[model samples]
Target: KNLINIDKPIKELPASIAIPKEKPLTGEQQKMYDEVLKHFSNPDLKVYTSEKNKSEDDLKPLEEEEKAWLTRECFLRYLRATKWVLKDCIDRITMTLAWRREFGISHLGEEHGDKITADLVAVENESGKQVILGYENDARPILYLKPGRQNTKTSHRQVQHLVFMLERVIDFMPAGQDSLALLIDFKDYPDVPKVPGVGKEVLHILQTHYPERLGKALLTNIPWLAWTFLKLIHPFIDPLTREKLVFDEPFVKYVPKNELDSLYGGDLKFKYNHDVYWPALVETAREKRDHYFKRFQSFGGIVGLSEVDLRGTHEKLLYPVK
Candidate 1:
């Protein structure tokens, strides 16, 4: 009944694959890393010091524990994004901090239910077709993308859903693995116009808030028209960033054959039923979102800090290196 033939005329869609556990930091790696981070520690970073002329009720300082966790978890990713240059890393982190504050990324988990739906064509398929099919051998999240699902009618909202999913995946990434591998399966949607704006905006978001997070992108069965469009954008992308976008590659290079979906020449075949998966996906995302809110509260919210006031507060912290 579907107008679009997804991944060829599949008589039946396959089941999802088992998600692997994320590897954690350990031993000397963890200890040594901790020691290195001490240079950037700010025990009082969370202190809501009142601003002059502002009431004690209006400040939102960074939480020490949460800041430390983010530093340990994500700081290095930004550092690497800038090629280990201290200044560039600092600038990028500051930009990210400001962006996060403005974007309210912390609340993304809470908004998933209202923002994502099956019609948006955003589902985590059990068969790894459109799901976060575990992590690569190196532990980076492996995302399977089916562009045929992009409906023009709801294109704008769909992009937002994609960003939401990306944020969720970032929260679940394994220690020391901050990037993601996108496997774009350009099958069946041959006539769908490739919107340059969509890619441009998505890339901008990645570079801005999630720097150095795109480990790689593999495109399978790409058409000539798509290739032409990609070539057009090549001049705009930096040399290093351009290297990450590969077309028509062997799936086995990034994901184990057993874990990959059959559409990409893998053993598994998952049935794609939006009705069965949409609610479940949103429910799972909501649970995660709730937990995130609880954790943020536990860390003491901006307004919850005793020293901070709650009026006309306009101060930006450099993600302070105290």
Candidate 2:
């Protein structure tokens, strides 16, 4: 009765060839890994300058503000990667039900300052539909720079702000239930201030107020300086940095922690595992595509996707996101 082509049982498909079971490296593979890490870790990777580059924005006069913006960009990049990672994971899961076609980004609200907003959205293959997600990266890169008291109360504000921002993110979720939500951590970069206390505070706030909303409150837990240093040579120091693949905690809200592990319902643990779950996670996402598709279908399908379409989707549905 409609015009799109995608109706097959995904489970009937063969196992993925691109995704493989990568076990811990050993023998010559280990040696080669170490050498690769050593070669890449050299200081040559660092880009240094006595003066700021020409292409840098004119906000140079405001050093603190500029640094914050850069920090935000760093986090933004990581968030972008996260979206790509998640979308791929979703596509894999929903392979039979839907396909992921493409992803798009946009800046919402004002043109400048930390308040600026950017949205990253993607399209599903079968439905020819788009799902939008919002990310407000670099929450307070220079929060550590403010020379003043470093009390728990001050730190609480940082955490509260993160939640408030996430609350706003819900409004940005695409028209369908398939849309996802993610809050990224600061990137590991040089000159970035160390704010461990703030990290804990953020985690605390997430657990306290809206634990239901966040997938998992991620904190790079490792200090920025050390993380940046290690990431620099992760390849050459393969043995040392092997654990970088995944990090776990007492609780992982991102995966429906409460759900019993089984084949029938959504099994996210496999996806979040350090080794090779991303592919399976992507498969899991594909399987769940209908959830969003059904939601969109309920509204009597929008004819096309344009800024106006996106806006209408938001106003009628996602803007006051849950």
Candidate 3:
């Protein structure tokens, strides 16, 4: 998709990149795109990369080796971020609100130790540290700013993580259940409108026109509500969520099961095999780029996207590539 955007800027003076107003990809178009994503979700069914590689575990992390496994996360994040930017903007936009986080040493104490997998694992911070986990799909965004696991002994580390963080930031009641976790998983949130070019305009529109609609569609929707509950209780409950939420099902299709949960409870028979369909990733990305540029042309695109905004959009993503 010629991510040459890195080499050259998007022009100092804003260019009115035209794009569609109602939607980038039409309903029919999105259906096809969804299928492509679905295929991408489980592109490869094989477990091992090759016979030479005894197990998928030997599939070799994309970047270089590291002494402290956690340190290697920087490179992995770079890879995910780079892939997000340079490839297809559609996928880039699709993953527009993903986040990564790093917790302090005290944050990782037993309270937060559950069923999370670390791409990189180590001991640091005068105590111990963890590598990065994959992208966490929450209502708001969460970046693994530091090392951590996905799930702790009781639930996904993120549930505890959010609850713990919120305990300090907001004076809301700490519900015994992971309702916050459910709320996050169900809704698309923290829609900070002032992103890059459309900052002022988008922010104003969200606050003025679509705050309630956005909340309802992005959150309170039945499917999102179901999804949040699914993830929050997936570990503890039986008759798992995946079984019920299949195609023709209520929830959106792209959400994947947590790998860490598989390690503790049961492995997902089907998981996204990014390694096998690497090229397809490129193709789907190209398709997304075509779609995005098509949308950009229609929107009368904005100008003045900063290098940081451009790079930030491209570079930040949470994936299990390593």
Candidate 4:
């Protein structure tokens, strides 16, 4: 008999690992924050002030709470990415907002509808692959990734599958915990083809738009080929990001031993059945799509979106070499 406890659902699992929170701005961070606000003159860049001309500077006034949300949820991401450089972070956020307008990221599932959901489910179960297992001590979701199960042919579809799942987990993220920990099971992944496009795009999206959302990524059983590939791509990754890419780290180090799956040398023996989980996740996504679509439409060609809203969508995600 497996040691699994089905009576306790995975969704209710609290975080065992405490993911760090965004700290108060340091002297450097404060400078960047002040500079960004000075450039825009307001925190309302996400809303439209006038229909006549929708320039970046023409922003609507925001409620105090809204401004706080933008500061905590939106602006700091760009600052961290640019290392608190005022000009570069401002430029990056501006471009990111423009990209969000073009990409329709906020309404992904609703815009695409359910037509592709079945296809996503099919690919999800193809190889017994990725799943949002539970949470760490900090309420950061723990994701189990088995790259060996990846069998998708189209690169865009691959990105869609990833984004769809990520959207689902967004609701599960604990307060003050904006990111997740990734447990990569590299066993048997070497047999698969090395497609650089998906990897590159994923990294680009995470670093450029998502910014500081990855709590950490632990790779287990990394094969020699994977190391060679990592070495090749090492130059492209920034130093701060490279720090999060840990290899051969034990899952129990970050996640509670009781919560982890035995397959990866943990206590729990939970098996992820894509067929079982996919339907539930589909229902969840459909529900979220309606809420997100309403929110997306609220912006209503609002001319400017909050930089957080402009985190980009999988709709525009493309493989580099392709």
User: Which candidate's lDDT is highest?
Assistant: 4
Report residue 213 deviation for candidate 3 (angstroms): 24
lDDT of each: 0.52, 0.27, 0.25, 0.57
Clashes of 1: 16
Root mean square deviation (Cα) for candidate 4 = 9.7
C-alpha RMSD between model 1 and the true structure: 10.8
lDDT of 4 by residue, 1-322 (tens): 5466531226544534454644666787766576676655443345443222447675445422233223334567677767777778877765554433333343244444333454544564445567767676556777778877666665666766676566566645544566777888877755555443878866665666566667778788788987889879988998878977777566677677666777776667775565677666556545544543444344442322332332224332121100
Residue 129, model 3, lDDT: 15
lDDT accuracy of residue 109 in candidate 3: 22
lDDT of 3: 0.25
In terms of lDDT, the poorest run of 10 residues in model 4 is 313-322
lDDT of 1: 0.52
Give per-residue lDDT, candidate 1, residue 41. 51
Could you estimate the TM-score for every candidate?
0.60, 0.22, 0.18, 0.66
- Candidates arranged by lDDT, highest first: 4, 1, 2, 3
Tell me the TM-score of model 4. 0.66
For residues 42-80, could you state the per-residue lDDT of candidate 1 as single tens digits? 444332222112334543555432352354446556655
